[PDB]
Amino acid sequence: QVASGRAYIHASYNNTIVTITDPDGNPITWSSGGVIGYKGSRKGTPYAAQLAALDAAKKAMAYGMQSVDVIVRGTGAGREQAIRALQASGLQVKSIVDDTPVPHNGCRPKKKFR
Amino acid sequence: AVKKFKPYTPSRRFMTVADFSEITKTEPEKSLVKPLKKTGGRNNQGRITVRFRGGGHKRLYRIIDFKRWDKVGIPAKVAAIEYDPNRSARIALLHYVDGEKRYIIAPDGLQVGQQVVAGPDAPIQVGNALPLRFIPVGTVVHAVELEPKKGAKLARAAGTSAQIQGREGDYVILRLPSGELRKVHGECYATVGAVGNADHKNIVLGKAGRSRWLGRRPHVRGAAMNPVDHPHGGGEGRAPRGRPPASPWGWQTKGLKTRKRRKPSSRFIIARRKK
Amino acid sequence: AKVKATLGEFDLRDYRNVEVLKRFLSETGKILPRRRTGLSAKEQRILAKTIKRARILGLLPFTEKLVR
Amino acid sequence: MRRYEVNIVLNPNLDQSQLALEKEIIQRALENYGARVEKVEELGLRRLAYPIAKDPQGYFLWYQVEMPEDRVNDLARELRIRDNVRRVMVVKSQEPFLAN
Amino acid sequence: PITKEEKQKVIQEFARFPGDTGSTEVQVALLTLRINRLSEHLKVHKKDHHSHRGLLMMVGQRRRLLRYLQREDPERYRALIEKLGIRG
RNA sequence: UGGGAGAGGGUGGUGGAAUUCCCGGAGUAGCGGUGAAAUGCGCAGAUACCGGGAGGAACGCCGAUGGCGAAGGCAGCCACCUGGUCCACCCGUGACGCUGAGGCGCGAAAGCGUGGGGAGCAAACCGGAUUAGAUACCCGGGUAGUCCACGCCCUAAACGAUGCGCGCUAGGUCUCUGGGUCUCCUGGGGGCCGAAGCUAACGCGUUAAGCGCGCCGCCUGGGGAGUACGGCCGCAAGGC
Ligand SMILES: [Mg+2]
Ligand SMILES: [Mg+2]
Ligand SMILES: [Mg+2]
Ligand SMILES: [Mg+2]
Ligand SMILES: [Mg+2]
Ligand SMILES: [Mg+2]
Ligand SMILES: [Mg+2]
Ligand SMILES: [Mg+2]
Ligand SMILES: [Mg+2]
Ligand SMILES: [Mg+2]
Ligand SMILES: [Mg+2]
Ligand SMILES: [Mg+2]
Ligand SMILES: [Mg+2]
Ligand SMILES: [Mg+2]
Ligand SMILES: [Mg+2]
Ligand SMILES: [Mg+2]
Ligand SMILES: [Mg+2]
Ligand SMILES: [Mg+2]
Ligand SMILES: [Mg+2]
Ligand SMILES: [Mg+2]
Ligand SMILES: [Mg+2]
Ligand SMILES: [Mg+2]
Ligand SMILES: [Mg+2]
Ligand SMILES: [Mg+2]
Ligand SMILES: [Mg+2]
Ligand SMILES: [Mg+2]
Ligand SMILES: [Mg+2]
Ligand SMILES: [Mg+2]
Ligand SMILES: [Mg+2]
Ligand SMILES: [Mg+2]
Ligand SMILES: [Mg+2]
Ligand SMILES: [Mg+2]
Ligand SMILES: [Mg+2]
Ligand SMILES: [Mg+2]
Ligand SMILES: [Mg+2]
Ligand SMILES: [Mg+2]
Ligand SMILES: [Mg+2]
Ligand SMILES: [Mg+2]
Ligand SMILES: [Mg+2]
Ligand SMILES: [Mg+2]
Ligand SMILES: [Mg+2]
Ligand SMILES: [Mg+2]
Ligand SMILES: [Mg+2]
Ligand SMILES: [Mg+2]
Ligand SMILES: [Mg+2]
Ligand SMILES: [Mg+2]
Ligand SMILES: [Mg+2]
Ligand SMILES: [Mg+2]
Ligand SMILES: [Mg+2]
Ligand SMILES: [Mg+2]
Ligand SMILES: [Mg+2]
Ligand SMILES: [Mg+2]
Ligand SMILES: [Mg+2]
Ligand SMILES: [Mg+2]
Ligand SMILES: [Mg+2]
Ligand SMILES: [Mg+2]
Ligand SMILES: [Mg+2]
Ligand SMILES: [Mg+2]
Ligand SMILES: [Mg+2]
Ligand SMILES: [Mg+2]
Ligand SMILES: [Mg+2]
Ligand SMILES: [Mg+2]
Ligand SMILES: [Mg+2]
Ligand SMILES: [Mg+2]
Ligand SMILES: [Mg+2]
Ligand SMILES: [Mg+2]
Ligand SMILES: [Mg+2]
Ligand SMILES: [Mg+2]
Ligand SMILES: [Mg+2]
Ligand SMILES: [Mg+2]
Ligand SMILES: [Mg+2]
Ligand SMILES: [Mg+2]
Ligand SMILES: [Mg+2]
Ligand SMILES: [Mg+2]
Ligand SMILES: [Mg+2]
Ligand SMILES: [Mg+2]
Ligand SMILES: [Mg+2]
Ligand SMILES: [Mg+2]
Ligand SMILES: [Mg+2]
Ligand SMILES: [Mg+2]
Ligand SMILES: [Mg+2]
Ligand SMILES: [Mg+2]
Ligand SMILES: [Mg+2]
Ligand SMILES: [Mg+2]
Ligand SMILES: [Mg+2]
Ligand SMILES: [Mg+2]
Ligand SMILES: [Mg+2]
Ligand SMILES: [Mg+2]
Ligand SMILES: [Mg+2]
Ligand SMILES: [Mg+2]
Ligand SMILES: [Mg+2]
Ligand SMILES: [Mg+2]
Numbered sequence: 001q002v003a004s005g006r007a008y009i010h011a012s013y014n015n016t017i018v019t020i021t022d023p024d025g026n027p028i029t030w031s032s033g034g035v036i037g038y039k040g041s042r043k044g045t046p047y048a049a050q051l052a053a054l055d056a057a058k059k060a061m062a063y064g065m066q067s068v069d070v071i072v073r074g075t076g077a078g079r080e081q082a083i084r085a086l087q088a089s090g091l092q093v094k095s096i097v098d099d100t101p102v103p104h105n106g107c108r109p110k111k112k113f114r
Numbered sequence: 115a116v117k118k119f120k121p122y123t124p125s126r127r128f129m130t131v132a133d134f135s136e137i138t139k140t141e142p143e144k145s146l147v148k149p150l151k152k153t154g155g156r157n158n159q160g161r162i163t164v165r166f167r168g169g170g171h172k173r174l175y176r177i178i179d180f181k182r183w184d185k186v187g188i189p190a191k192v193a194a195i196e197y198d199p200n201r202s203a204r205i206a207l208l209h210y211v212d213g214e215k216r217y218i219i220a221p222d223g224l225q226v227g228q229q230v231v232a233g234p235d236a237p238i239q240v241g242n243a244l245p246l247r248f249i250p251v252g253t254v255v256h257a258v259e260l261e262p263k264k265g266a267k268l269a270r271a272a273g274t275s276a277q278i279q280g281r282e283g284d285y286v287i288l289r290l291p292s293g294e295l296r297k298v299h300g301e302c303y304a305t306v307g308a309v310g311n312a313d314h315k316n317i318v319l320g321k322a323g324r325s326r327w328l329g330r331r332p333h334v335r336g337a338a339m340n341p342v343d344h345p346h347g348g349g350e351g352r353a354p355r356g357r358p359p360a361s362p363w364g365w366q367t368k369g370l371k372t373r374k375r376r377k378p379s380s381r382f383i384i385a386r387r388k389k
Numbered sequence: 390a391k392v393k394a395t396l397g398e399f400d401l402r403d404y405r406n407v408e409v410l411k412r413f414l415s416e417t418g419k420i421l422p423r424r425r426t427g428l429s430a431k432e433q434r435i436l437a438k439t440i441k442r443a444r445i446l447g448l449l450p451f452t453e454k455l456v457r
Numbered sequence: 458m459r460r461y462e463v464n465i466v467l468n469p470n471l472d473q474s475q476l477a478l479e480k481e482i483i484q485r486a487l488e489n490y491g492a493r494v495e496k497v498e499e500l501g502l503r504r505l506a507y508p509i510a511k512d513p514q515g516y517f518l519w520y521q522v523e524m525p526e527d528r529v530n531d532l533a534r535e536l537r538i539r540d541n542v543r544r545v546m547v548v549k550s551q552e553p554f555l556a557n
Numbered sequence: 558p559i560t561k562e563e564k565q566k567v568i569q570e571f572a573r574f575p576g577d578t579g580s581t582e583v584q585v586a587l588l589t590l591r592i593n594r595l596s597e598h599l600k601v602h603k604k605d606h607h608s609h610r611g612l613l614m615m616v617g618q619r620r621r622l623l624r625y626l627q628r629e630d631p632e633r634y635r636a637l638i639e640k641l642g643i644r645g
Numbered sequence: 646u647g648g649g650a651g652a653g654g655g656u657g658g659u660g661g662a663a664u665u666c667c668c669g670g671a672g673u674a675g676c677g678g679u680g681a682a683a684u685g686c687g688c689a690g691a692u693a694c695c696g697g698g699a700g701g702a703a704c705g706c707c708g709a710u711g712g713c714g715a716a717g718g719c720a721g722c723c724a725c726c727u728g729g730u731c732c733a734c735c736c737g738u739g740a741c742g743c744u745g746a747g748g749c750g751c752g753a754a755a756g757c758g759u760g761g762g763g764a765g766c767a768a769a770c771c772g773g774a775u776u777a778g779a780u781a782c783c784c785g786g787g788u789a790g791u792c793c794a795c796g797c798c799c800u801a802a803a804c805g806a807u808g809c810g811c812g813c814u815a816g817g818u819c820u821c822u823g824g825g826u827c828u829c830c831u832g833g834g835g836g837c838c839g840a841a842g843c844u845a846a847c848g849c850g851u852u853a854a855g856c857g858c859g860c861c862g863c864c865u866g867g868g869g870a871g872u873a874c875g876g877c878c879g880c881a882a883g884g885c
Contacts (some may be wrong), residue, residue: 006694008693008694009693010692010693010694014676014677015676015677015692017676017692017693018693019672019692019693019694020694021672021694021695022671024670024671024695024696025670025694025695025696026671026672026694026695027671027673027693027694027695028671029672030674030693032674032675032692034674034675035673040678040681041678041679041680041681071694073693095456096456096457097454098455098457099454101663101664102662102663102705103662103663103664103703103704104663104703104706104721105662105663105703105704105705105721106662106664106702106703106704106705106764106765107663107701107702107703108664108702108703108765108766108767108791109664109765110765110766111766112783250538250540279698279699289699295699315760316759385699393557398555398556398557399555400553400554400555401554401556402553403553404548413707415706419705419706419707420705420706420707421706421707422707422709423709426707430709430712430821430822431650431821432556433707433708434651434712436707437706437707438707440706441660441721441722442546442548442723444506444660444661444721445544445546445660445661445722446464446466446546447466447503447505447506447507447544448503449506450507451660451705452661452662452705452706507661526724526726527725527726529725530656530657530723530724532724533658533724534658544659544660545659547723548723549724558727572737573738574737576736576737577737577738578737579736579738580737580738580739581741583737583738584738584741594727595727595728598726598727599655601656602654602655602656602727603655604654604656605654605727605728606654606752607655607714607728607729607751608653608655608726608727608728608729609728610654610714610728610750610751611727611728611729613749614728614729621741621742622741625740626741628741629741
């Protein structure tokens with residue numbers, strides 16, 4: 001059981017993945033557009049992220065989790081709604097930080113990003 | 115820089131020779147040579163046990179110092195750089211301030227006149243030898259011992275080197291010339307720098323004769339033989355392999371791994387070679 | 390609210406003056422545009438250059454997480 | 458001769474003896490490459506903006522020196538060899554550029 | 558680079574009269590100085606093509622002067638290229 | 646002589662973010678992908694998360710309608726070596742100039758040779774889609790190559806589709822970078838709008854496509870054709 005921990009929001013154009021960890025960063029539970037039952041592009045919808053964030057929060061609280069720090073990565077549509085759903089879940093959201101990876105001009109991207 | 119020839123014979127067209135530019139002395143130290151007893155690839159029963167060997171130029175063996183930890187703290191001046199017919203590297207004559215003289219394999223960049231020394235306190239400079247544990251992670255090295263005091267076994271061929279990758283307790287992690295990743299005990303000595311004569315691999319023998327000078331006798335294909343001789347022997351006209359390609363002794367020769375499975379050193383080998 | 394105003398005399402070339410230089414960095418660690426630093430073209434060019442040195446010494450970040 | 462500023466971050470978790478030894482290797486080095494120290498400023502520990510050698514702090518040395526041009530890249534190389542030296546940065550000294 | 562002192566020494570050595578700067582011999586000598594220094598540079602940096610353009614320009618410049626000097630006074634020309642060891 | 650700006654060039658070092666892979670931990674039922682899908686990956690434990698490591702390539706913000714270079718082109722930061730260029734002083738030389746057939750050098754990418762290197766990307770190739778079909782577009786893979794050294798190749802919408810130099814012919818406005826006495830003035834760049842003039846028009850207009858002089862290159866209806874033949878160059882591709 002862990003009272004406080006972290007909530008990671010991996011939000012892309014195709015899906016939203018939410019994984020709740022412990023304070024060290026080790027996963028307790030996770031959920032996504034797939035887990036709450038969507039397939040295909042539907043997983044990238046804001047509502048999908050909402051159900052996902054909830055199901056992840058619900059599962060987490062079942063381990064005693066009360067407070068979380070929210071770490072957000074990605075520019076997906078389901079982003080804000082996931083953040084929303086975490087707040088409106090019953091968890092304390094002690095903080096909110098975006099840690100989205102951005103290169104300082106590293107590897108050549110695939111064709112579609114050029 | 116390998117030396118080319120004009121095509122004034124069919125063979126000189128392709129033949130290349132080493133330029134021998136690093137070489138400053140063309141005679142070996144008399145007290146550091148002994149006769150190399152030629153075997154022809156025959157063992158003590160008189161049997162060929164390695165095929166196609168013999169008939170190469172006469173050679174004297176140069177005694178090489180593969181220990182170094184032998185004379186810790188005693189600096190030596192690099193007196194000369196010489197040819198060694200028994201190895202691909204060049205060799206460097208050391209004059210210890212001791213008055214003792216020895217050979218080491220010549221590192222890349224070694225200069226006659228310069229000074230080298232061995233020991234835990236040696237400066238990190240080309241030609242010096244230290245236990246691995248005192249050599250900075252990342253520095254490229256050669257003439258590495260495998261076990262402490264047993265002598266340099268690793269990275270001795272022309273142009274080769276190992277790189278220190280990291281440390282783990284009593285051991286240090288090397289990338290061997292083969293790309294194999296391996297723990298080697300920290301007390302093992304190594305010499306900083308890479309082995310010299312890096313252009314060795316660009317030499318083109320050019321003609322059958324040159325292989326003979328080296329003691330390599332003609333290799334004959336299994337496919338050129340008869341079934342008494344070889345798995346590939348026989349067949350009317352030319353023949354494909356007609357079975358998995360095999361050695362003269364019948365074991366498979368395309369891919370079949372042959373290192374012993376339950377070997378104790380497996381505990382020390384982190385990652386098998388590349389490529 | 391231009392950063393150059395909030396300071397008096399400072400050295401555009403002093404890569405060790407973390408306290409002054411950290412003003413010219415956004416809350417995300419990035420180098421601020423001229424429209425926030427009030428610097429001319431010539432002075433911004435010196436600022437950027439000495440900021441990068443300070444980062445290499447370890448005195449300024451290359452990047453920072455964005456807290457909301 | 459030109460004037461340079463030798464910047465050095467050392468292992469922040471040495472004792473004052475090892476620290477003193479490092480400073481000694483450095484000083485002999487400075488002299489060996491013909492560098493004449495003019496000013497010198499030892500700021501010691503400092504919170505780093507990011508970890509270096511996986512450590513939040515670094516121990517800062519700083520020497521304004523005067524030395525021959527050709528030897529400075531070599532000097533820097535010699536300075537970096539020791540494990541406890543985690544950064545070296547040798548800069549040409551410049552007149553300050555003032556704002557305001 | 559090439560220092561203020563060294564330049565002075567060359568100038569005073571080829572100056573036609575006490576204050577003389579910018580005369581042909583001084584110009585040729587200053588160019589001859591830069592040329593030879595660059596030549597050495599390019600021997601090590603064979604791949605610095607952009608600076609080599611600089612060399613061609615200097616060589617071109619010196620060439621024109623020496624034609625001029627040799628046009629005017631063959632005597633000072635022969636003595637100048639000899640004092641510098643230039644023809645070839 | 647005294648200064649200035651700059652991704653100008655070369656060499657040696659060195660920093661951080663990110664991708665991939667490998668190791669350890671934690672965790673479970675999907676992940677990825679698209680217009681929607683499927684191939685693919687995943688209970689042999691993927692994705693998402695944390696720590697460790699390896700390695701190659703490119704340098705976020707600054708960054709701009711910006712700067713530099715003859716052109717190609719040049720962008721983390723440090724040092725060394727080195728080119729061009731501008732200004733102020735008006736000190737020296739005394740037409741020493743302009744151009745420039747040949748020649749020589751440089752010359753993006755792709756390509757070639759020998760050797761290294763190979764993370765990402767990606768011709769060819771394999772597969773999934775799409776579609777009437779789809780040797781494509783999209784998706785999942787994937788080898789040369791992309792990177793380094795040396796040697797070749799010598800092309801291009803190599804463009805401002807605008808040769809170089811000089812003199813002359815309203816100004817307005819933004820900008821880069823010097824020197825003033827710092828209002829502003831004056832140099833050198835980079836844009837925009839426009840006097841006169843030019844132009845078939847579009848447009849150009851002190852960065853001329855205006856008015857003049859010098860020298861070079863080039864055109865002479867479309868296709869055939871940058872082909873053939875000859876010659877010269879190249880390892881070849883193929884170039885002139
Ligand atoms: Mg999706
Ligand atoms: Mg050689
Ligand atoms: Mg030859
Ligand atoms: Mg030959
Ligand atoms: Mg010959
Ligand atoms: Mg013949
Ligand atoms: Mg032949
Ligand atoms: Mg020879
Ligand atoms: Mg040799
Ligand atoms: Mg002999
Ligand atoms: Mg004897
Ligand atoms: Mg005897
Ligand atoms: Mg023997
Ligand atoms: Mg024997
Ligand atoms: Mg016997
Ligand atoms: Mg017997
Ligand atoms: Mg017998
Ligand atoms: Mg045999
Ligand atoms: Mg034999
Ligand atoms: Mg030899
Ligand atoms: Mg050889
Ligand atoms: Mg060979
Ligand atoms: Mg032999
Ligand atoms: Mg053979
Ligand atoms: Mg054979
Ligand atoms: Mg037969
Ligand atoms: Mg028999
Ligand atoms: Mg039998
Ligand atoms: Mg048989
Ligand atoms: Mg057979
Ligand atoms: Mg048969
Ligand atoms: Mg047969
Ligand atoms: Mg047959
Ligand atoms: Mg037969
Ligand atoms: Mg046969
Ligand atoms: Mg046959
Ligand atoms: Mg066969
Ligand atoms: Mg057969
Ligand atoms: Mg068969
Ligand atoms: Mg066997
Ligand atoms: Mg062993
Ligand atoms: Mg170090
Ligand atoms: Mg300063
Ligand atoms: Mg010039
Ligand atoms: Mg002449
Ligand atoms: Mg000057
Ligand atoms: Mg794992
Ligand atoms: Mg990780
Ligand atoms: Mg930009
Ligand atoms: Mg521009
Ligand atoms: Mg320009
Ligand atoms: Mg005058
Ligand atoms: Mg006069
Ligand atoms: Mg021509
Ligand atoms: Mg080219
Ligand atoms: Mg290329
Ligand atoms: Mg290529
Ligand atoms: Mg090829
Ligand atoms: Mg190649
Ligand atoms: Mg070939
Ligand atoms: Mg290759
Ligand atoms: Mg690969
Ligand atoms: Mg296909
Ligand atoms: Mg189909
Ligand atoms: Mg069909
Ligand atoms: Mg397809
Ligand atoms: Mg593809
Ligand atoms: Mg791919
Ligand atoms: Mg191919
Ligand atoms: Mg190939
Ligand atoms: Mg090919
Ligand atoms: Mg090349
Ligand atoms: Mg041409
Ligand atoms: Mg353009
Ligand atoms: Mg132009
Ligand atoms: Mg054209
Ligand atoms: Mg022309
Ligand atoms: Mg001014
Ligand atoms: Mg101005
Ligand atoms: Mg203007
Ligand atoms: Mg206009
Ligand atoms: Mg009009
Ligand atoms: Mg006209
Ligand atoms: Mg006018
Ligand atoms: Mg105007
Ligand atoms: Mg202009
Ligand atoms: Mg016109
Ligand atoms: Mg025609
Ligand atoms: Mg043709
Ligand atoms: Mg063509
Ligand atoms: Mg032909
Ligand atoms: Mg043409």
